[PDB]
Design a protein around this nucleic acid. Structure first.
Ligand SMILES: [Zn+2]
Lengths: 128, 229, 217, 212, 95, 172
RNA sequence: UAAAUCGAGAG
DNA sequence: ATACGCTCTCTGCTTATCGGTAG
DNA sequence: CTACCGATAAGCAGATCTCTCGATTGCGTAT
């Protein structure tokens, strides 16, 4: 994860704002991401450079008993993409394996969002 | 925390779950459930009740060509000697079956005319590995030997524990099959209801004749036959 | 870390904190070479952390047992844990065998319902006699007093007793037999200094024992 | 290894002297800042084994303490050379306190005090007796970074405090009579300790805790 | 009849009694009740090494540092290759 | 239990799941996942299994993970080695996709668990019963349609598109 | 006019 | 047509029982 | 030898934001 995140950081450093076709302030995506109106730098990085490594509870994509991260990957494949590294971007779309990994990450995010609200009310009740 | 759980289904798509627990003492326990409560039996009892077996037959069926494996030999010796210690009288298949039938007669609502050997055979045929059905006592015995060997392999750290949450180990209750099985349970309840009606007739009334069509049609009208409701 | 930690502090006021820690400052006099070894002079060492393997040779017909313990090389555990042959052998003689015999007697009570050299010297025989006398049912004992890579001893039980696992017992005892430990402390670390100050982080809480080490802490 | 015991006893003696000095009795910094070799010469015989009968000493209130706390009397600090405390030692210690009429005597043992001996600690009012393990005094708690400065208030200042905030004695924050700092200062139930607390937002500010 | 630490009857196969729990010089089967002398069964020696995993530690870890060819019938017959070239899609098998 | 898993590829839809309390628990099927509803004719399979090299379990004298247990629908049929077990598993797949042999239904799920170091218990399993989850994949040899199940899928490699096929590692 | 339980939703 | 009996917890506290003291 | 002071192993209790809809509500004898 550290190495693939370093690669992601290199890509983002190289490809924005230098590689953008439209520049700030004309580029409204960057205009509203830099000014804080809405969004962040990671959002425009995912939109324009790559999604990057998908983290499932701090780890990479889960592995089956056979050692395959997915049916389309050979067992114990030493690939960043096999482990959940999405090189695609939301501008050009993502491959079905990357789509599956991103779905895993989004589902985990929704589960955490649902479980976080229920985990904090009792503390405030007891304190109050 | 080890174990081997199996969910067998009869041809009519109803399920019985058999759980083999491993006890740190060294004995393995067969676990099932009949109406709404759980029951436990040393699995050597069921192994000898299923078919005519020696004690070395179980040893060969569990321990294969790996005679020189200390773990399996010690565990199986513990199991067999525990069964010998706890039940020194049980020596042949029919005696074990009679003991089992005596133990499980009240719960199973067994009829007074049922011999203990035959009610033990019935308890076997209704509980242990139903998916083999009747006449599959040899197949049930082989399956139990395989499951015991799998449990011992798990407790020895030679197998990963299967994940019930993974869809690799799951199936779908279609709803129509659930409809069929709940209807079957209601029909069973209907038969029990008519028998309970004629039982309350035995202890109260006197105009009772099993060979009379009039009595049959009279007592059938006394139960709630509205299964559809 | 996070809300559960708050749950420990505010909601429960747990004296039994799930993961206790302790921070120790470092005198500028001491060096990191000494620091890395001081954290190994406090961190606990179970007897199991040095045993390479255990071989139980059971021959029944009184029951016999040859509880051979094969250790890692002396240069290995004498460096990784700073544990020498004498300390390990004393722990085995005093602590390990007592716990093993207690567990065996308890189990029986609840169930009633390359070749090592044979020749020995003068002192080893007397040590074997003392170990036999102090314990209940040991008839042989020996330790590799020259290399410290094995320990073979006998264990006799009544011929009436049925079969015991005698490997799970040893596994349980070895993980609970202790070479060296400061009470309530299981490990000491030397993390990277944060905000400048050099700190030792320990996974237990015992102030009284850290009060002794004025030299380092 | 006996050197380790000597050093531990030296540290315990230093911390006991610091505790006595903090309690308000006259102890000069010469006694507190005692070098280890000087301690060995003054308290270890030819064999080098320290004797704890000569370590026992007496202290008297300072001029300022008598001005502020008129009720204070002499203090007797005892070390037990015996590896344990029995009925014989405790009762003899109590009688030694009585016959010299000491207002307070603090007991320092080595391993433990027998429960039959523990019965004689509250035996004789008003002269209280306090018990301290040697191993619990190897490091002075009040020298720790987190502990603040505790100063026991006199009766007049307690009146002024309970008059300024219009309080009962009980409405104050409480400090346990058995927590280490209260044993250090020698707090008897009823009197207040002022606490000079260094804050992250306000620097020095004064709190007050009554012992109950 | 002797395997591991247990002895099985040569007639029926029921597990025999522990020899050291019976009167000397005669073992009797539990079910068929045959005659077994305690001789020739001198040593029930079984060795048991630990799991080689029961002791996790730090020093422990330091001693451990397009075409498809398919076999259809049995090990004797040669592998059969199924090609499906992407140039034209023509698929065929080869032995 | 709410986690999305790689085993559900092609059976449970990764996207279709409510947000909130039922997240992960209430999910939906992939649009091509047909659930079995009738028992396949598995009467003739034991006969052709014996011809392949399976040793019948009635007179085998074998047990353990060191040999491959060949079972059908929860009934031990034989004991053949892991290598020959893999050979006969691939043979059964090839014969079942090539719909010539009458004894092999197209819906026969062939779950082969090869030997592995402390992995899943090895052996050859054949399922043909009710309520199984089945999805259509494309068997690359014969370029035909095969039906696979969750148990059968976690060990074979199915390329997500023909442009990503690799030699000797993909069969579907 | 009420109450549970189940089910479905919204933020 | 009709009335009255019913199978995968976190934090403690609280209880029962086991050793040691000293009486 | 016997009675008091603890010292764990086992058992037991309560507990872990608002809002909008719809649908059901029991049987089993006895007279
Ligand atoms: Zn016999």
């Amino acid at each position: 994860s550290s190495k693939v995140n370093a690669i992601t950081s290199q890509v983002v450093s190289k490809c924005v704002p230098d590689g953008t076709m439209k520049k700030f302030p004309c580029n409204s995506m960057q205009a509203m991401a830099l000014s804080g109106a809405k969004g962040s730098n990671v959002n425009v990085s995912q939109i324009m450079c790559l999604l990057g490594q998908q983290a499932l509870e701090g780890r990479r994509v889960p592995v089956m008993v056979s050692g395959k991260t997915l049916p389309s990957f050979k067992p114990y494949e030493t690939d960043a993409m096999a482990g959940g590294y999405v090189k695609g971007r939301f501008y050009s779309g993502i491959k079905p394996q990357e789509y599956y990994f991103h779905c895993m990450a989004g589902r985990e995010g929704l589960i955490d969002t649902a479980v976080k609200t229920s985990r904090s009310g009792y503390l405030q009740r007891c304190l109050t | 925390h080890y174990g081997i759980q199996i969910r067998s289904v009869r041809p009519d798509q109803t399920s019985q779950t058999n759980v083999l627990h491993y006890l740190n003492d060294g004995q393995v326990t067969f676990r099932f459930s009949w109406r709404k409560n759980e029951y436990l039996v040393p699995v050597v009892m069921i192994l000898k009740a299923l078919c005519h077996t020696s004690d070395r037959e179980i040893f060969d069926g569990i321990i294969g060509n790996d005679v020189k494996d200390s773990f399996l030999t010690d565990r199986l010796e513990l199991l067999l000697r525990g069964f010998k210690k706890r039940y020194p009288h049980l020596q042949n298949r029919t005696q074990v079956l009679q003991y089992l039938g005596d133990k499980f007669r009240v719960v199973f609502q067994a009829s007074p005319d049922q011999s203990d050997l035959e009610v033990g055979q019935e308890v076997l045929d209704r509980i242990v590995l139903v998916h083999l059905g009747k006449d599959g006592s040899q197949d049930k015995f082989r399956m139990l030997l395989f499951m015991i060997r799998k449990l011992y392999s798990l407790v020895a750290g030679e197998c990963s524990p299967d994940n019930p949450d993974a869809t690799q180990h799951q199936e779908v209750l279609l709803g129509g099959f659930l409809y069929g099985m709940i209807l079957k349970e209601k029909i069973d309840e209907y038969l029990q209801n008519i028998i309970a009606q004629v039982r309350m007739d035995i202890n109260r009334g006197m105009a009772i004749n099993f060979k009379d069509k009039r009595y049959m049609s009279r007592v059938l009208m006394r139960v709630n036959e509205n299964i559809g409701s | 870390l996070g809300i559960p930690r708050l749950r420990e502090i505010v909601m429960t006021a747990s004296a039994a904190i799930k993961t206790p820690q302790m921070t120790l400052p470092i005198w500028n006099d001491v060096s990191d070479e000494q620091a890395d070894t001081f954290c190994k002079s406090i961190s606990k060492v179970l007897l199991s952390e040095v045993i390479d393997k255990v071989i139980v040779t059971e021959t029944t017909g009184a029951r016999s047992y040859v509880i051979h313990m094969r250790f890692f090389d002396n240069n290995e555990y004498s460096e990784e844990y700073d544990v020498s042959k004498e300390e390990l052998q004393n722990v085995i003689s005093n602590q390990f065998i007592h716990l093993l015999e207690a567990a065996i007697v308890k189990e029986i009570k609840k169930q009633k319902r390359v070749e090592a050299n044979n020749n020995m010297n003068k002192v080893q025989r007397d040590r074997q006699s003392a170990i036999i006398s102090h314990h209940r049912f040991i008839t042989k004992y020996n330790f590799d007093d020259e290399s410290g890579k094995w320990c073979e001893f006998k264990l006799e039980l009544a011929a009436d007793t049925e079969k015991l696992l005698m490997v799970n017992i040893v596994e349980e005892i070895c993980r609970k037999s202790i070479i060296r430990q400061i009470p309530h402390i299981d490990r000491c670390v030397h993390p990277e200094p944060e905000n400048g100050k050099r700190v030792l982080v320990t996974e237990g809480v015992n102030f009284q024992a850290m009060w002794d080490q004025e030299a380092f802490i | 290894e006996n050197e380790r015991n000597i050093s531990r006893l030296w540290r315990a003696f230093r911390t006991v002297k610091e505790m006595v000095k903090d309690r308000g009795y006259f102890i000069t910094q010469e006694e507190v800042e005692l070098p280890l070799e000087d301690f060995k010469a003054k308290y270890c015989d030819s064999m080098g084994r320290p004797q704890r009968k000569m370590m026992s000493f007496q202290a008297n209130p300072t001029e300022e303490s008598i001005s502020k706390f008129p009720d204070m009397g002499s203090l007797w600090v005892e070390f037990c050379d015996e590896p344990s405390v029995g009925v014989k030692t405790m009762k003899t210690f109590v009688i030694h306190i009585q016959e010299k009429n000491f207002q307070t005597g603090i007991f320092v043992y080595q391993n433990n005090i027998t429960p039959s001996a523990m019965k004689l600690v509250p035996s004789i009012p008003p002269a209280t007796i306090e018990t301290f393990n040697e191993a619990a005094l190897v490091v002075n708690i009040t020298h720790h970074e987190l502990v603040p400065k505790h100063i026991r208030l006199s009766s007049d200042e307690k009146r002024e405090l309970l008059k300024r905030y219009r309080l009962k004695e009980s409405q104050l924050p409480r400090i346990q009579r058995a927590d280490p700092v209260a044993l250090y200062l020698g707090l008897k139930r009823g009197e207040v300790v002022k606490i000079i607390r260094k804050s992250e937002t306000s620097g020095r500010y004064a709190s007050y805790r009554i012992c109950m | 009849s002797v395997v591991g630490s247990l002895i099985f009857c040569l007639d029926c196969g029921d597990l025999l009694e522990n020899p050291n729990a019976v009167l000397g010089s005669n073992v009797e089967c539990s079910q068929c009740k045959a005659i077994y002398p305690k001789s020739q069964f001198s040593n029930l020696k079984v060795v048991t090494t630990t799991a080689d995993d029961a002791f996790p530690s730090s020093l422990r870890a330091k001693k451990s540092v397009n075409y498809h060819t398919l076999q259809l019938r049995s090990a004797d017959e040669g592998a059969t290759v199924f090609y499906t070239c992407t140039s034209c899609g023509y698929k065929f098998r080869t032995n | 239990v709410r986690k999305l898993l790689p085993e559900s590829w092609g059976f449970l839809c990764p996207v279709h799941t409510p947000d909130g309390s039922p997240c992960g628990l209430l999910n939906h099927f992939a649009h091509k996942c047909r659930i079995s509803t009738q028992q396949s004719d598995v009467s003739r399979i034991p006969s052709i299994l014996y011809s392949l090299g399976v040793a019948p379990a009635s007179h085998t004298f074998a047990a353990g993970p060191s040999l491959c247990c060949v079972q059908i629908d929860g009934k031990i049929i034989g004991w053949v080695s892991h290598e020959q077990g893999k050979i006969i598993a691939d043979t059964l797949r090839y014969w079942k996709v090539e719909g010539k042999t009458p004894g092999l239904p197209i819906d026969l799920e062939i779950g082969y668990v090869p030997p592995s170091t402390r992995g899943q218990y090895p052996g050859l399993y054949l399922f043909g019963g009710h309520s199984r989850m089945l999805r259509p994949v494309r068997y690359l040899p014969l370029d035909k349609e095969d039906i696979v199940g969750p148990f059968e899928q976690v060990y074979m490699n199915i390329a997500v598109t023909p442009q990503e096929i690799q030699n000797n590692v993909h069969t579907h």
